[PDB]
Amino acid sequence: VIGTPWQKLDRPVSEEAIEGMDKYWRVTNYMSIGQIYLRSNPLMKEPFTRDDVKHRLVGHWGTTPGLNFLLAHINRLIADHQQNTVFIMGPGHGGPAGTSQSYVDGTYTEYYPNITKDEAGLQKFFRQFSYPGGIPSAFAPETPGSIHEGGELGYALSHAYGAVMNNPSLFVPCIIGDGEAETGPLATGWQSNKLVNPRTDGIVLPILHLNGYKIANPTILARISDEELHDFFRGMGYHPYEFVAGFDNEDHMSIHRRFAELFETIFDEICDIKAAAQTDDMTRPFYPMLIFRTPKGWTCPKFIDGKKTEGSWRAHQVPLASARDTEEHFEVLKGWMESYKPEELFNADGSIKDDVTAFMPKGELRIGANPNANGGVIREDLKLPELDQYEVTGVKEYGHGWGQVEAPRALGAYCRDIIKNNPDSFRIFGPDETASNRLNATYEVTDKQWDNGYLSGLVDEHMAVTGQVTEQLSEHQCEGFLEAYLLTGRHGIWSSYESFVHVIDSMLNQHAKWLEATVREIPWRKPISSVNLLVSSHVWRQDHNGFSHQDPGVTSLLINKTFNNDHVTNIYFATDANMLLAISEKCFKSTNKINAIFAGKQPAPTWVTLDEARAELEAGAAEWKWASNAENNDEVQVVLASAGDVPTQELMAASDALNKMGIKFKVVNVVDLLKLQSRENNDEALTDEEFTELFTADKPVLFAYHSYAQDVRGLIYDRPNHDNFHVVGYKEQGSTTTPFDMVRVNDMDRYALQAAALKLIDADKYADKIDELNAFRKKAFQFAVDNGYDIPEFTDWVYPDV
Amino acid sequence: VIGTPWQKLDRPVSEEAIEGMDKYWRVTNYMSIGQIYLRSNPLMKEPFTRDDVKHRLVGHWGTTPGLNFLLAHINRLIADHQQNTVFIMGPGHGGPAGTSQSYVDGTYTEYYPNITKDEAGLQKFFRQFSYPGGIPSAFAPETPGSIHEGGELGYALSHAYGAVMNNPSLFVPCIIGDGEAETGPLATGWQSNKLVNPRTDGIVLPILHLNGYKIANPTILARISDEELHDFFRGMGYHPYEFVAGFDNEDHMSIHRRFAELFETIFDEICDIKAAAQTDDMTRPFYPMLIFRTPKGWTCPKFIDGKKTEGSWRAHQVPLASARDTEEHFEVLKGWMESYKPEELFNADGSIKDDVTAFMPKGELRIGANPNANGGVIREDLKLPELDQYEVTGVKEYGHGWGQVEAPRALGAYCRDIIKNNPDSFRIFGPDETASNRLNATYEVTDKQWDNGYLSGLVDEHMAVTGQVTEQLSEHQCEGFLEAYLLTGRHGIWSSYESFVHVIDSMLNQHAKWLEATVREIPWRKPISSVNLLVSSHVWRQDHNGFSHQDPGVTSLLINKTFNNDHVTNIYFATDANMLLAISEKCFKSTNKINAIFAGKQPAPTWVTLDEARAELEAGAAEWKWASNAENNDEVQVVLASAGDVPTQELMAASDALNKMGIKFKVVNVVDLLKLQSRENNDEALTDEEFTELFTADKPVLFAYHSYAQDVRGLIYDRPNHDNFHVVGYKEQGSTTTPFDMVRVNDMDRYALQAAALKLIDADKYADKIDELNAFRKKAFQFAVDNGYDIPEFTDWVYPDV
Numbered sequence A, B: 001v002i003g004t005p006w007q008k009l010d011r012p013v014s015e016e017a018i019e020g021m022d023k024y025w026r027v028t029n030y031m032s033i034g035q036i037y038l039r040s041n042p043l044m045k046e047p048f049t050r051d052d053v054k055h056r057l058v059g060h061w062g063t064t065p066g067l068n069f070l071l072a073h074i075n076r077l078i079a080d081h082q083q084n085t086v087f088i089m090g091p092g093h094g095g096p097a098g099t100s101q102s103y104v105d106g107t108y109t110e111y112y113p114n115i116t117k118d119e120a121g122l123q124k125f126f127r128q129f130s131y132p133g134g135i136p137s138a139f140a141p142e143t144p145g146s147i148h149e150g151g152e153l154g155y156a157l158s159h160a161y162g163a164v165m166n167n168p169s170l171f172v173p174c175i176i177g178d179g180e181a182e183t184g185p186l187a188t189g190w191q192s193n194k195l196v197n198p199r200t201d202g203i204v205l206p207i208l209h210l211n212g213y214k215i216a217n218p219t220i221l222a223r224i225s226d227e228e229l230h231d232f233f234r235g236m237g238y239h240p241y242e243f244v245a246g247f248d249n250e251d252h253m254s255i256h257r258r259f260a261e262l263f264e265t266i267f268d269e270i271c272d273i274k275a276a277a278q279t280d281d282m283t284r285p286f287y288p289m290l291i292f293r294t295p296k297g298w299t300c301p302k303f304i305d306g307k308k309t310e311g312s313w314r315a316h317q318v319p320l321a322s323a324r325d326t327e328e329h330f331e332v333l334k335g336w337m338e339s340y341k342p343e344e345l346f347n348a349d350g351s352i353k354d355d356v357t358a359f360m361p362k363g364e365l366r367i368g369a370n371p372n373a374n375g376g377v378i379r380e381d382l383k384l385p386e387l388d389q390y391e392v393t394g395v396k397e398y399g400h401g402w403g404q405v406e407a408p409r410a411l412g413a414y415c416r417d418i419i420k421n422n423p424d425s426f427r428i429f430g431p432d433e434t435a436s437n438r439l440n441a442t443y444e445v446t447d448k449q450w451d452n453g454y455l456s457g458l459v460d461e462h463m464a465v466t467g468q469v470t471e472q473l474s475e476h477q478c479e480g481f482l483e484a485y486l487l488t489g490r491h492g493i494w495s496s497y498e499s500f501v502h503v504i505d506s507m508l509n510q511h512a513k514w515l516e517a518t519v520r521e522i523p524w525r526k527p528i529s530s531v532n533l534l535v536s537s538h539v540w541r542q543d544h545n546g547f548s549h550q551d552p553g554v555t556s557l558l559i560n561k562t563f564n565n566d567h568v569t570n571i572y573f574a575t576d577a578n579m580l581l582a583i584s585e586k587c588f589k590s591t592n593k594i595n596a597i598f599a600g601k602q603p604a605p606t607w608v609t610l611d612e613a614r615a616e617l618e619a620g621a622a623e624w625k626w627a628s629n630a631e632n633n634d635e636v637q638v639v640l641a642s643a644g645d646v647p648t649q650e651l652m653a654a655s656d657a658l659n660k661m662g663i664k665f666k667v668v669n670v671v672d673l674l675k676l677q678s679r680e681n682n683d684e685a686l687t688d689e690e691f692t693e694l695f696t697a698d699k700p701v702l703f704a705y706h707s708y709a710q711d712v713r714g715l716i717y718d719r720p721n722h723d724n725f726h727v728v729g730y731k732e733q734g735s736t737t738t739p740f741d742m743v744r745v746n747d748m749d750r751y752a753l754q755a756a757a758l759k760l761i762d763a764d765k766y767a768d769k770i771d772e773l774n775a776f777r778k779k780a781f782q783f784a785v786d787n788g789y790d791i792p793e794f795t796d797w798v799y800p801d802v
Ligand SMILES: CC(=O)c1sc(CCOP(=O)(O)OP(=O)(O)O)c(C)[n+]1Cc1cnc(C)nc1N
Pocket: A062, A063, A091, A093, A151, A152, A153, A154, A176, A177, A178, A179, A180, A181, A183, A209, A211, A213, A214, A215, A219, A296, A316, B431, B432, B433, B473, B497, B500, B503, B545, B549
């Protein structure tokens, strides 16, 4: 247990704490401006000159003094209440406030010993911000206290709420930009309070950083009427409080006293909600939220060159862009830095006075030190049930290609038992698709958590105020909840219809970049569990839906995060259920990855045994010797290669026809896609020798690919024999139609695959056979048209074991 | 002018109209169920049997009877008020309601002559829904009356609001799913009413289709309290009205009378708002919205096999899945279809009785016939200003490589004059980045439209209640507003920081698929203007931001919509301003495309004249002969090839050093990326002969690519000499740093490009030179570290003309 959670003070904030908060605010304002502007001479010792100003002024002042003010008060809160606390910096461009925070709390020097607590350290701290060889401009993963960089805006609230799931002692003040609140993902994020439980989860306090402006515009929320702003948050299930400061001549000490008192009313109400939830955990309370209305750029010069700067979008980035070049700008910078009176805040040796920091929390309650903000220090391996019990044994008993299993059901049974073994640290998310993607065996041990109205057991099933499944019709919520759940040291998986995974492409990009920075250069940030995404209800079998639901292209996005041997991205094609089991165990053990696990949920053949799946997964690609009919590679007329459940089904049927014609070939299945890349691009891929052994040195390869053929072409560009690969993939063809038609129109059906194989072998010789196969596809199509279902010869085919 | 806009009735709805609406509702319910279930015998003539039921039951009943009920009433409204009206079907899976609508209004038979108004036509209409060779399950572009398929949920409100911009006579009832309202994009969509003007734009009426459920869950909005739901919409600037029906025994005729009266109160208030706006166009009114609360699956059987179906998520897709197979299910289907009493709705010949349709609007007021729902019939070509006036003439006067022009500024001046010539039909959108991406010369003739509070000319600049620029911090709003603006026959452009274009990857996917279906098979849907996206503030120069803002990968998404010779996607790299001008004119003339226009906004050299840009754009790729030093292709030791402004700058400097070493090479610039593909993949690409002429038959090619090298590798896989291309692209390296460092860490800087060129030519011979170049990169880096700005030899370099 960290600290003493949800305790009220029952006394006013002390005058000593108010004095320390104003010193904090002034010192973090001063150091934030030093980080942006100063290359040397951080204490402005004589001579202080333009030569001390950075040649390239980059970074953001506007948001920053409001964040420094809240951080003073959140620090004071944490210390007085001993409250386990992670904050979210929605306006992540306020990096300097987050680095100042860590430098003041002592974690910066603890994690970065060269950046010491004295004039030499402070000089280096100022120079390195946004600087070549230095540190980023945003609240990056290399800052102690960050679980959310906030570079791409919109995910502040999904992260805040994912962090408090199953974390009942944790408090998350979530600082949201008022421009950020104009984004889609943030706008839906407010509604998460219908999906957390006040007894079993922790508490988010949204703080709207209503500074009136985004980069070059006012914001929507700051200019609507007060009555609309309050109704809006009340209608989203919050009790709105609002604080207004900085627009008149009110002295800063009164501002701190008024804010501390308000913040204590807010926290008392959170503590009442937490206490009440021990007895009534079914009534959804109105959680407080805070509207925090202060001037953008607060405490910078009111006007610069005749233009209003404090209280304006002009304060957004870097005021005084000529601070190095003019002297008029230099004098303004100088008076601005002086207004904080650093001579009272730093000792002669350049260490921050004890005065400034006596009110601060200590030890693991410090914002930089809390292990929830470095959740790998708390993560434990999952207690995984043995895989063998889930195996589809029909392939051992009856043969390769047996049955009509719905593959994700085996993963559901496995997830069920994971939740049973790990009842408060493994969650499932879905955007209203958990049952649709067949992971509903999980409901045998838990419910979808829903903290909003109930009506009737005739309609409410597998749903309760507490539980380990979470659904909301929003891929942004599912992805963002899961990310923070992982970043705070827990585990889980989510599932999405494949085409809609694209809604969150850009979130995958940011989490991949968080991982990249981390595996490269932040070894104190310990490994977290991986994002595990079941990509299902795929392009080939969207039976109730049509062309809008046919887009397997997240493969292609993921290919753009496969650099430098970071190894933070995996693309797996689950050939069948036993392959799915083997991939999933590996993903549930992995850390520091995004794993995209492709599987069909339609009834489908099971191809491999579990033991086979386990060996084939590890190689990445394997020959299926029981399916090949060639003696060796020299006798092979074509390589039949497949990635995905449906391409594999269609290639298998093609191999069966090709065998019966006396064509000699081998069958290669591809599971771990990126292991096709060269060793030069991927030090864990198949070696050239292993690749040649699979795909031959010079025979034609027919490659039937689940997604866009572009992917495979670009990946094998420098591989031996790559010029002989013919890649067939999805090509933007299809609609609401039968299963054969959907493969037919992309040349993916078995008849077209057989034809393509014949054509690669000898186009002249098999010209008639090819015609005949093409004519057969037409006839099968007409049959579907005339009759309403696919030709029995297509649907009834099973691979020659039985 | 269509109809008589914003006229009140000033009498009750007639009893004849109430009777016709109930007939409409019953006939569209009946035909929606026939489309899902019936392969033959649409009027259930003796014998009516399981043999008439589809073998594959696919499609969605749940949403559909609520949509049919609203459509009856929106039809009645349109007819009585003669109101120019386009509706949005947010729950686009309610396709059968939209096809029924068009069949009833007469547009279906007008656009599809084989689907006639009689028993044979009705039989074909039922069979073809979601059926091989037939029509889609959603409200697809091939349905008259659709400008929004609603397959991927979330964009209902951005489309509705983009449709009414500059469209002051148009009314858009926008039907929103209550599950759909849980998505990010829909949640922010509600706020668009702060960005439209009630005098110069038309009016959206949001209708929340609060049927209580999404696929397998209740919805958030349906289960919060009434007081929260009302406060929510009031806080977003609407006046909420709420209608509740279908949960008790109230007869259907009373339901219609109560709804018609409510809908007339709502429309009267819209008419008051419209009249008032003729005098006060600055006060933002509270626009009505409608909460429409009815049971999901309304009028289907209450219970099926002991499970509550009407009023449940169980009604979502296809009830009675065994209607063909059991007979118990068949009898239920039969009694359900009978409850609508089709014998009163259809004549003996199977035509819908005159009775049913006498209340309907006629001519171009019909929902299927309105030209706003087929906006290419109203689109006119833009009155474009002559391009030559914008040309950067510094290259003619001083030489290739001249100056420090910020390229998008020339496009801004051009957009400015487009708006001046086309003052109410060309709009600019930006997510708070119009000025940042340098398109602000537009503000010389118009303002950012903002219909929300004003404070002071000290802060409010270039902003007014009416204007042709729209900004909101939401890529989903910008993309969705623009799409509907185009679909209703107008024009525009938007700009985004390149990495954040990914927020809307999935919207690009759906608009590309809308285009694909349209250019393939819907010739009555006339061409619309293209999406024009300025992708700027790119990976190489994100100076105030860092690694989160470095992702050029939308190139890769776009590559997945380049099939079948649809030609609906373009990727252009604007080498400089004159190239940008030439691309932009072409994009502003094009139709039926998404055009991604890549350009840097940093100060940069201008390489080509405008006349040259115009010729080079058309070829797609060109040799820059004034830069090459080889006599012919046989004397070439390496091809220096570039796409993007910064790769080109770096390759140019490399060519200058290579020239001075006595290396022989040619320079090829790539503008129209997809013209690298083979003719087999792209019938408008460079022929093999033209490609060889550019890239030689067998010399090494160094290709410096703006985005991920994967793209170029996959595109040229079947090109002559492709094995000799070495593609250098962005490789997930960078942070907040100097411009040289950002190219350096991706091996894109001129020194690394020179080295790579040497290595391709003779690695052994130039081993020392390569070492020396690598050492120089280290020294340049140390210099940036020590000094705070890049080495003068790097920054001060200008191409040898002067
Ligand atoms: C940094 C960056 O790229 C910024 S900061 C900013 C304005 C934020 O205003 P807000 O009111 O939220 O914050 P404030 O500074 O506290 O006032 C924008 C539009 N952007 C570009 C941007 C665009 N779109 C998205 C999704 N994310 C970002 N970061």
